Amino acid sequence: GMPPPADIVKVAIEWPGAYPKLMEIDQKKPLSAIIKEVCDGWSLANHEYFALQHADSSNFYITEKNRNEIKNGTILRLTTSPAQNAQQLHERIQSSSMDAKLEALKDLASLSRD
């Protein structure tokens, strides 16, 4: 026999200064992985900042619910998410050094000089 056809849908995505990106939205895949596959097509950094948007009608941002409004041949748009803004209370400055040693430590030794 043969299984039922997949619910995967082809889309065209808008972005400023570029031609529309053709790609396929798999309804089984996470939107975070799909958005990473959008922004990498234009070499755009920090995919966590981004969301998909409907360009043809509604202007609904894509979500785990709103992904079901997408059909084959939907005109979408890439945009930074309304969730991206947050209070600038702290920063992970620990990337500069994990542990500042008092002296440079080593254990290298040899029988004789080179």
CA distance 40 to 34: 10
Tokens of 15: 């972005």
CB 10 within 8 A of CB 22: yes
Count the domains in the chain.
1
> Which whole-number Å values give the CA distances from 104 to 98, 99, 107, in the listed order?
14, 12, 11
Nearest to 72 by CA among 6, 13, 7, 9: 9
Helix, strand, coil abundance in the chain, percent, nearest 5 = 20, 20, 60
> In terms of residue numbers, what domain contains 27?
1-114
